[PDB]
Amino acid sequence: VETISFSFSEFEPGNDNLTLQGAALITQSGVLQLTKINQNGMPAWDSTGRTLYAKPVHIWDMTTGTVASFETRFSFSIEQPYTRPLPADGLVFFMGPTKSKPAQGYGYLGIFNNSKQDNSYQTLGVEFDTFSNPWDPPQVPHIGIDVNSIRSIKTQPFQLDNGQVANVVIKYDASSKILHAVLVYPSSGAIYTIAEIVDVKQVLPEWVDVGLSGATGAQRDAAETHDVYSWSFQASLPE
Amino acid sequence: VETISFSFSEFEPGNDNLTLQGAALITQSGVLQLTKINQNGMPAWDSTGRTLYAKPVHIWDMTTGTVASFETRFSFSIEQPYTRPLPADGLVFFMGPTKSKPAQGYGYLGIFNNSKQDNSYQTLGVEFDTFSNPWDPPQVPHIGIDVNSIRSIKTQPFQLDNGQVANVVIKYDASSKILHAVLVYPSSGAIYTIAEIVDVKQVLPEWVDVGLSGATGAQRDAAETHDVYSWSFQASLPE
Ligand SMILES: *[C@@H]1O[C@H](CO)[C@@H](O[C@@H]2O[C@H](CO)[C@@H](O[C@@H]3O[C@H](CO[C@H]4O[C@H](CO)[C@@H](O)[C@H](O)[C@@H]4O)[C@@H](O)[C@H](O[C@H]4O[C@H](CO)[C@@H](O)[C@H](O)[C@@H]4O)[C@@H]3O[C@@H]3OC[C@@H](O)[C@H](O)[C@H]3O)[C@H](O)[C@H]2NC(C)=O)[C@H](O[C@@H]2O[C@@H](C)[C@@H](O)[C@@H](O)[C@@H]2O)[C@H]1NC(C)=O
Ligand SMILES: *[C@@H]1O[C@H](CO)[C@@H](O[C@@H]2O[C@H](CO)[C@@H](O[C@@H]3O[C@H](CO[C@H]4O[C@H](CO)[C@@H](O)[C@H](O)[C@@H]4O)[C@@H](O)[C@H](O[C@H]4O[C@H](CO)[C@@H](O)[C@H](O)[C@@H]4O)[C@@H]3O[C@@H]3OC[C@@H](O)[C@H](O)[C@H]3O)[C@H](O)[C@H]2NC(C)=O)[C@H](O[C@@H]2O[C@@H](C)[C@@H](O)[C@@H](O)[C@@H]2O)[C@H]1NC(C)=O
Ligand SMILES: CC(=O)N[C@@H]1[C@@H](O)[C@H](O[C@@H]2O[C@H](CO)[C@H](O)[C@H](O)[C@H]2O)[C@@H](CO)O[C@@H]1O
Ligand SMILES: CC(=O)N[C@@H]1[C@@H](O)[C@H](O[C@@H]2O[C@H](CO)[C@H](O)[C@H](O)[C@H]2O)[C@@H](CO)O[C@@H]1O
Ligand SMILES: [Ca+2]
Ligand SMILES: [Ca+2]
Ligand SMILES: [Mn+2]
Ligand SMILES: [Mn+2]
């Protein structure tokens, strides 16, 4: 039984348990700002940032065929300061190949390079998409389950509570192969739920890096904040 | 596409859209008290009460083989006034044969007659169990998914926020056959999630009654309240 877990009630600058990539930065106030925020306090466009836990996770074993069950919880806030242009692009929790570097930003959220469903990506993600690309459903924002593609296999529209903290819970039961995610806004009491069957043995490599990635838009001011306040994770491999 | 829906932001006494059975009663304050509350304001033991929506729901069609997707949301509160004996028994959201009457109370929650897994029950339920019977896991309270039996196929322990309002969301996606439930306590911000694969065509009859049932214990003072503040439901049959 290989178990791994971590819990950050807040982030500390200089911490060596997190790998910051791109624009990602931990403020002195303990907040993880995935995307860049200017001197004037406004979110910068054309920005991509990621944060990966410093240790790889054993998600499944090819020898025994066993797969781990896991759960992650995190709180974030997205603030959209401008009426026009439309804000973009969103943030995502993901699992993929170890030692990875940021991919394409914008609508690809820093984890994909195109809009193809390619098995070589070996990536599983739960997105919180704020901009409707041609591969997206018309409603934004939306939660989406991404399996080797930015074209979600399942989406769930939600209403953004501008600048309010949202609580997220993502759980994966290896026995039933169900990936269930929940988004709750304590401010308004709104609850959103989404679930889909995902066999990680068909998607991910045995060892993966777990992280959070965020991206702002491809044009001036098509931006918003992607702030994370806490993040915990736990995985248990019967093997 | 056969759709049916209802939404009760509060309950009105005398309403003919709800079938009250057993001890169930709607107060002048708009609260649905599933189980009996004495003159002294304390919950009575040996009490069972149910509330069924007055119209049957078309859940699946045998001719076309199509099955409906549905979602229900409700708020309730359980108050446990005594340290001893242990409180009991809990409440449950259920779907089963039309024109049904209350079954055994106590640990059977008013919807089962024994602890056998019998296909003739044709009942699907999501319980919020407060007393650990011999067929129950040791942890209480717990959320459970019941399929033709009081012995849940899946359980999830949760911490009771005594007398606080809990918000529940239960969703069923016919395409994936996933039944996902969420319990949130706004008071503490606690979020609980549970999911399992359930093929309703193998469990329920084509037409069903949807309801809520609650029960108090088999001995003096083994009791608690089972108050419901609101309840909404919607189902869509592609046929
Ligand atoms: C957040 O970051 C923290 C800081 O990095 C993490 O804590 C570190 O976790 C390290 C485990 O990876 C741990 O490393 C060991 O350190 C031992 C010496 O330090 C302790 O003992 C000292 C006295 O002897 C004392 O003064 C210190 O205060 C510590 O108590 C050392 O003996 C160990 O070496 C043995 O094991 C390694 C690995 O098998 C062998 O390589 C080695 O030969 C020997 O057999 C080990 O040393 C580390 O070895 C690998 C090498 O690359 C590293 O440089 C070397 O440090 C380290 O002690 C702590 N640091 C502190 C200050 O406690 C923290 O990890 C979590 O908490 C720790 C305690 C542990 O339980 C981990 O499993 C947890 O993940 C990070 N938190 C998270 C959630 O990631
Ligand atoms: C909560 O309870 C409410 C009260 O019971 C529900 O509202 C009732 O819903 C009934 C539908 O089942 C509806 O019944 C129809 O009433 C028609 C006459 O009343 C209307 O028109 C009057 C003037 O003509 C006006 O004064 C009234 O105020 C109403 O506007 C009547 O013509 C209908 O009859 C036709 O259809 C039936 C069924 O096919 C045939 O049997 C009949 O031959 C004729 O063709 C119909 O009458 C009902 O027929 C069945 C019989 O057993 C009933 O006794 C008879 O009433 C009724 O009007 C309303 N009541 C009110 C005050 O609006 C409410 O239902 C929801 O809302 C209604 C409007 C409808 O949209 C339903 O689908 C909804 O479920 C309940 N809410 C919920 C969530 O359950
Ligand atoms: C100046 C201009 O019109 N530029 C557009 C880009 O904005 C556009 O890229 C999209 O931009 C939105 C935000 O406006 C999101 O970032 C989205 O993910 C991007 O794809 C591109 C391609 O559509 O076209 C011009 O370059
Ligand atoms: C007086 C006494 O000990 N009576 C017990 C019953 O309580 C018990 O039934 C259980 O009672 C608990 C609450 O105490 C729950 O209601 C539970 O669901 C019941 O099964 C029965 C059977 O165990 O034994 C005596 O009758
Ligand atoms: Ca998008
Ligand atoms: Ca029980
Ligand atoms: Mn999307
Ligand atoms: Mn139980």
Select from B173, B178, B193 the Cβ nearest to the Cβ of A182.
Answer: B193
Strands (E) across B98-219 are located at 124-129, 142-147, 154-157, 166-173, 178-185, 190-197, 207-216
Contacts of A28 (CB under 8 A, 6+ apart): A13
Pocket of ligand 1 from Cβ distances under 6 Å: A 6, 16-17
Q: Which two tokens stand for residue A36?
A: 């860049």
- Chain A CB contacts of B180 under 8 Å are 178, 180, 193, 195
Is B138 an 8 Å CB contact of chain A? no
- Answer yes or no: do B195 and A195 touch at CB < 8 A: yes
**CA separation, residue B133 to residues A6, A86, A88, A92, B43 (Å):** 35, 55, 52, 42, 20
Select from B73, B182, B197 the Cβ nearest to the Cβ of A176.
Answer: B197
Question: Contact, B179 vs B170, CB < 8 A?
Answer: yes
Please give the Cα distance from B147 to B141 (Å, whole number): 19
Helix and strand element counts for chain B (H, E): 0, 16
- State how beta strands B25-26 and A2-8 pair: unpaired
Contacts of A29 (CB under 8 A, 6+ apart): none
Question: Contact, B110 vs B102, CB < 8 A?
Answer: yes
- Domains of chain A are 1-239 (2.60.120.200)
Within a 10 A sphere around the Cβ of A61, how many other Cβ atoms? 17
Interface test with A, best of B9, B184, B194 (most A CBs within 10 A): B184
Ligand 4 binding pocket mutation candidate from B86, B106, B130 (most atoms within 8 A of CB): B106
- Answer yes or no: do B196 and A182 touch at CB < 8 A: no
Q: C-alpha angle with apex A80: A77 to A83, nearest 5 degrees?
A: 165
Please give the Cα distance from A221 to A45 (Å, whole number): 6
**CA separation, residue A59 to residues A62, A172, B63, B152, B197 (Å):** 10, 11, 43, 28, 22
- Chain B CB contacts of A73 under 8 Å are 191
Which 3 state secondary structure label does DSSP give A200?
helix
Cα B184 to the center of its chain, rounded Å: 16
